[PDB]
């Protein structure tokens, strides 16, 4: 899966030498991921040795950050050089509706090394309540994986892309492995656009 050259925005974050989380590139200097990812320090390896390796400077966790507002912005020590290999992903101008067809590309963390893409369906943030009674559906996306798909292919903080735009950051709901019946829980990115844009000081 995952045609070559697709996912130019895909970021893998490492703590020390070890893989920690996945992220999105929202600006030439800025990577977005889940707040549960930062222990600090991290460093970004971006694009689809290596393509471009950047160290992170500023870690801005969402101020209202079982994960309520699971989002953090990591500023790269130097801007990436933009190109077909590596570009930012467009931020949402609108919110994705239940029933839309989206995508997630993972490396298979949680148990040659490729990106695999899978289609995903936006459930309603009510259907989300039947698997996790007591989840506050808040600003979130329950994303249904097609059946026979192992949710654990994905990574933490990996993007959910709908209609070429970024609608979500993987927060929780990946486990258990081995079944697609349970939906993953993503932070709804179109709800945070005021904070994201202003931390980038694009305002």
UniProtKB/Swiss-Prot annotation:
Could you say which tissues express the protein in this record?
Expressed in breast, ovary and prostate.
GO MF: serine-type endopeptidase activity; serine-type peptidase activity
Q: Subcellular location, in the record's words?
A: Secreted
Write out the catalytic residues in the record: 36, 70, 156
Q: Name one GO cellular component term.
A: secretory granule
Q: Signal: present as a keyword of the record?
A: yes
The highest taxon in the source lineage is: Eukaryota
Boundaries of every Peptidase S1 domain copy = 1-201
Name a biological process GO annotation. protein maturation
| Keywords of this entry | Cell cycle, Disulfide bond, Glycoprotein, Hydrolase, Protease, Secreted, Serine protease, Signal, Tumor suppressor
Disulfide bonding pattern of the chain: 2-95, 21-37, 102-162, 128-142, 152-177
- Give the function comment from the record: Has a tumor-suppressor role for NES1 in breast and prostate cancer.
Q: What is the lineage of its organism?
A: Eukaryota, Metazoa, Chordata, Craniata, Vertebrata
Q: What is its EC number?
A: 3.4.21.-
- Name under which the protein is recorded: Kallikrein-10
> Where does this protein have coiled-coil stretches?
none
Give the record's family classification.
Answer: Belongs to the peptidase S1 family. Kallikrein subfamily.
